[PDB]
Design goal:
IMP; oxidoreductase; binds potassium ion; TIM Barrel; binds inosinic acid; homotetramer; 14 helices; globular; alpha/beta; IMP dehydrogenase
Chain lengths: 373, 373, 373, 373
């Protein structure tokens, strides 16, 4: 046999590292279709830094964003998301007066705060019609820090003109455009002057766009191809939709996302809008393209329910600490280093067959209780 | 970082567009195995034109055809299908006298109408035996506009001779031959003088041909290979079977289909034959190769039930408006442009892993109600 | 557009026929993973001949063989299998005296008959131990026509010596060796003097060999690789296991099988051993490697139940007529021509994605009844 | 046709053996994704030797190791595992005093025994913190034969230093490091001075690491790549996790594992800790990363239940005799020969499509009882 002392040296006899680079990995796959291979641990998980760029000029201490949906994010969610190092995007399924009030509630309230006034950071969504011009003006007056142009298909003349108008009218304000899933879409909205990109189409838990429009993209592939382009321009991208656990968050970032947006995961929490009901304690969770949401006609989302998840004061820290441990297993001390080591090919990946996915999950038990924390 | 002003220019640094061309996409896959990537929106969905060639000389305002099945299309269906810009193919699981009466009912009744008499367009199915010669003569007397030669395997001497006979005897009448799923089948029936082709074998919701005959083809692949050939001869093709939502319709056309035929989707509607019953309001839906259908012995279809879908006066417009929005997302202003941009490689596609398909649908909800419109 | 008259000629512009040849098709797939593409119909299904070589010197009018299992084939099954143009292999989970009696019952009783005595053809199974030497002698005295050496793994010194002994002692008797799934296994038993081969390992409905032994092969792949070799020596092969419908039979033969063996399909029929019981009218069906079967300790099969299928006097004709229609759709007039056209590349195949398989089956119905005939 | 006498000779006309070599087989697959092809039987299964290297200096008569989990292995399990030719690894979810007592119970009690004192061999697990240094000293005093450094991610400075310390302080003691799933991890811990490696991350039945950490590897692939490296240094590797039947054990070894570790399979047995309860006779089985286990906060395992499996005095022999039959089918007389014939390419493999896996299992039965032995 070989001398154990030569073990590390012998690795050089191999053409490349074990596993695949991100380039080799990247068809039409998404998060559950692969794993990241473990690396070398020479630091505690507590040492892991999770600072993340939301936009060109806005950086969060945590890559967590609550989605602009009327069953996920209002003032209560936005406040506590900001307090916990993330941020919330307030929905616009409401009057411009009602939305502005929610913004004021946040602004008048690791924490995400402005550098000048020390006020909590607040985001909000708007449509791309002429009526939303006045809406935005009201939100800006309320102290809005960042606006999300809310669309399933963001590459449009209407959105492009909206971007151009905001940059001229509100230069200080940061603009996140989307949604997008292709390189060509990204270039268009980057060229328009977007400060960030929202990635995803049909990956949402409550979304059926892909079913009824035949249009969208697998989330993992969308994140890679978009960010591979957008990152060259220093435009941070939000991985929006299909996120359901800590593992999805790590993978989203690995593929180039700067932050991740969550709807269903945050739906059913105490801080979410809507009241609990019993059927088991549930809350309503619905796509904004659902008939209910649109009426509150071609639906692109559904109305459903999610079980009580408790307060995000316990859930977000779980995501935070969990993501720290994830980075540790991979052998990276920050999300910045995570990005660098992936693009350099140091971090390695591996595909997962359907059998490997079943093996990866809980299997062959009479019964079990899934207590995450 | 790169200057945002160079974003669109930088796209030229890439060898090809993001995603796959239809050629690259096209083994043995069907509709659910892929997506169309979104494009550029610079028009309203209302601007989208859905005019479609049914046959060489017949063009519809909507690519919707009701299947010739005794649980789908009789006079009531055919009338309302024509009124809504589509057309109905009346079944022949009935006497020649009974079928001709149904045709007369339609003819004596965006709308699909003749250019000379302004009467509603009507289609009908027949077998390929000698007895159907007289049957057809009766249908022609009733004012039939187009005939469908109804067979699971249309590439036969019997069908070929039937085609040849009709073209000689009834030159004005348009003939749709089928079903076919291969290039060789198409050439044979095109050579015979077919004015259109019916594509599909075993893709039907109620069909088990592939199970009991081991013969057929995945619908998506069948449409591509057949139309890639048939379109060179200006022979429109009907994508028949396996259509269940708007997404399937968009994809069918993307692969080369001119129109799409629906059975199960239209079964259970008010305009369909058969009475509602309760088990939940249901209607019977059965393959014409089912024992029931054949007796009203090797079965190639099944007898089943479908829930009440309501009137097609609300369902077809939903398909219509939905398809308009689908084209908009893709960035095409008509089905003609859709065809052109696909064959040129402007429209791009993406595969879907099993995980991506699960992600694409509704996932990780306690419960939900699927209200399409 | 192109002139329709040139349609058939234009096919020559294509490098190869639509679809795949069997070579191109053939990893690790089985029957449900592919389809045969339809061809040209210029004959009635009644014209299709299904004569099939069971062994070097024995030819059946139907490629149907009942498996040697104590819940499938005793005298009653063997008699009626022979009468209907197939043959039955009597099990040996019984005394040598008991088995010989069953053989005598068949011999003393399209039909499969001897050319000299006009008596029904009869097959029987035996083990490969020394005790089975006397057993066989008794079966031969009873008028046995063909013997099956019954083993999950037929490539053994014990089986090889058993083959050699039979050929010397009983030259007239035909010997089917097996089971096998590889080329190397086939060569060994062909070299030993086998008159036919039994193909299959772990493909059985009641079999778990692959689970507990990690040894076996996908049935489709096994048939191709074995027969590709065995056919060069004029050694007919039985495709044994995993057959569940007419489609599987057509595909088995397409890949090189001369006949097919059925257990589960024939289990639960009136002619099968064991009594009906109620739980719905059921019969017991069990692997011969099951603890029950072995005790009537490492099990390689299970004990289960199957619903009443009725008499094989109606089921086998259904298989017969169904297979005729299958050949017709493909455009072949006999199983001999089927073999020839496949090996020449005239018959074409197509893969099936998981989606294509779901599409191929019954889908999207509230409910349905599967009446085959 | 060809002369049967030339059958074996004709095999030489083929470029390579039927099926795939292990290299060709080896992406991201695991055990259920493939089969081993049968070989030549020229010996009885009783002749098969299952001696296996646990570590550099420790060899077992059976490749069976019980996992260090508080619902699997305490003194009772460890004793009977050693008696039956395997070994048990005692968990450390208990005080150092409690663990040492369990070791003494084993030491003071085909059988796995020391060569000098004839005492039963005993293994035990420990953490990699400073407190475990004293713990180990107590275990060594109790007569511990081998220590397992218990971690989901063994490639750490803490584990590396722990290894280095043990080799200096307790030279006689054998050290198994892990867990690992990559080549780079292996080299690191081999270089540190490991006497054996524990392979697996997220493949456990009760483990969700891959879900919550996005980190791990398909078990089959992990075993191959790690052992392909580790075996060059004569470092035996334990395939840990995802083992559920005899088939998995055979495959684990085929890919390079020297022994296999079982948790769930041995959970629910009489010799396991914890009492039976009724819900059907069940026992608790839980991941050591479960909240319950950790509290007896980011969970990486779950708490569940498994049905009563009976005594391992009947189960392990079943595994033993089953593995013998498995080797026989493959045509190897020992696990050593198994290794040699695989690396030489004599043993062949075959992929399994999802259809082939369904075909491989029990299918198309009304009902069945799975009696393994
Ligand atoms: O009705 C809808 N149609 C289309 N996309 C939607 C709809 N509702 C929400 N989404 C998207 O889906 C995301 C939520 O995905 P989830 O986090 O998987 O629930 C949102 O942030 C939106 O990007
Ligand atoms: O009994 C049958 N055997 C074979 N194909 C059938 C049968 N009944 C209907 N079909 C085909 O299946 C289509 C309906 O498919 P669906 O729209 O998926 O229900 C029809 O238009 C026919 O082309
Ligand atoms: O106990 C068993 N172990 C292994 N193979 C078996 C056993 N019982 C039956 N078989 C095989 O499985 C075939 C039946 O497959 P089926 O037709 O799919 O039920 C038989 O003809 C045998 O070749
Ligand atoms: O809580 C846990 N987190 C991660 N891995 C675990 C945990 N509990 C057990 N394992 C691993 O899973 C193996 C058991 O796998 P099983 O044999 O498939 O149940 C153990 O031997 C450990 O290697
Ligand atoms: K797992
Ligand atoms: K979705
Ligand atoms: K079908
Ligand atoms: K099986």
């Amino acid at each position: 046999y070989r001398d154990a002392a030569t073990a590390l040296e012998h690795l050089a006899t191999y053409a490349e590292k074990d596993g695949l680079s991100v380039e080799q990995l990247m068809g039409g796959l998404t998060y559950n279709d692969f794993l990241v291979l473990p690396g070398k641990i020479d630091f505690p998980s507590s040492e892991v830094v999770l600072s993340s760029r939301l936009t060109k000029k806005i950086t969060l201490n945590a890559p967590f964003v609550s989605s602009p949906m009327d069953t996920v994010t209002e003032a209560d969610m936005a406040i506590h998301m900001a307090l916990l190092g993330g941020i919330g995007i307030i929905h616009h399924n409401c009057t411009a007066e009602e939305q502005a009030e929610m913004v004021r509630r946040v602004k008048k309230y690791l924490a995400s705060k402005s550098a000048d006034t020390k006020q909590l950071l607040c985001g909000a969504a708007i449509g791309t019609i002429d009526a939303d011009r006045q809406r935005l003006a009201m939100l800006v007056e309320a102290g809005l820090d960042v606006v999300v142009l809310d669309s399933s298909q963001g590459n449009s003349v209407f959105q492009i003109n909206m971007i151009k108008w905001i940059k001229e009218t509100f230069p200080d304000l940061q603009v996140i455009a989307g949604n997008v899933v292709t390189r060509e879409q990204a270039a268009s909205l980057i060229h328009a002057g977007a400060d960030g990109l929202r990635i995803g189409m049909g990956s949402g838990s409550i979304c059926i766009t892909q079913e009824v429009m035949a249009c969208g993209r697998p989330q993992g592939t969308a994140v890679y191809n978009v960010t591979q382009f957008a990152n060259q321009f220093g435009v941070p991208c939000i991985a929006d939709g299909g996120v359901q656990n800590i593992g999805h968050i790590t993978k989203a970032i690995a593929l180039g996302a700067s932050t991740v947006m969550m709807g269903g995961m945050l739906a059913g929490t105490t801080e979410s809008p809507g009241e609990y009901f019993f059927r088991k304690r549930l809350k309503t969770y619905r796509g904004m393209g659902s008939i209910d949401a649109m009426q509150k006609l071609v639906a692109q989302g559904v109305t459903g329910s999610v079980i009580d998840k408790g307060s995000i004061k316990k859930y977000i820290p779980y995501l935070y600490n969990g993501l720290q441990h994830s980075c540790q297993d991979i052998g990276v001390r920050s999300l910045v280093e995570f990005r660098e080591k992936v693009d350099s090919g140091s971090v390695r990946f591996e595909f997962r067959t359907p059998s490997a996915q079943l093996e990866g999950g809980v299997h062959n038990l009479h019964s079990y209780e899934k207590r995450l924390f």
